[PDB]
Amino acid sequence: DMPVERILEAELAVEDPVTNICQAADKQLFTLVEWAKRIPHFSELPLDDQVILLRAGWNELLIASFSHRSIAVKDGILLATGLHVHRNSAHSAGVGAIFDRVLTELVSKMRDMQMDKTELGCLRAIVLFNPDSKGLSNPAEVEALREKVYASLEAYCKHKYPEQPGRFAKLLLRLPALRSIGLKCLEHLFFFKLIGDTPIDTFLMEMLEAP
């Protein structure tokens, strides 16, 4: 059983522009661990698989969080630290391209369809249960958990928004954009580290380091 009610409880339970973005990212990594523990059956996975899943999806998981958190913001991002980053500030920092991609492809799309927190949690759980993660001791088990997530999500969409039959497919079709945006954001993270100009904290540094 993969009840969306508990997945919602997990989301509700965890509730220089570049430097401020890295600070918020490092701060949310600690919170991300607590969130994953609240997703049903995640803590029951082998510890090494839990590590693999988080190291593989931490970035997309955080990006999906601050994007949905910013649906009410006008041309800006609301960082977990409480700071509002406007697209002008991001453009003046040299990261305007990827920042714009987040607004057009994620925040705005979430705002237009009024993606609720239950659907966001289900999507974050879907990316969390990535059976393609390399090194998983049992990828089939992780895929079975993913299948139960989007199985409960579809039923929730067809019951909550019965007049929007395509809402379920629309939700899943934002994951490709989430995947590419995460890769690009990660490249920026490596350039920030490589250039050595930006402070990278311990937990965020650990994610930048190889397996």
Binding site: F30, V33, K37, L47, V51, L54, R55, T202, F203
Partner: peptide, 9 residues
């Protein structure tokens, strides 16, 4: 490392 310590408790 830090992830392991946080996944324990």
């Amino acid at each position: 490392k830090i992830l392991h310590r946080l996944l324990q408790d």
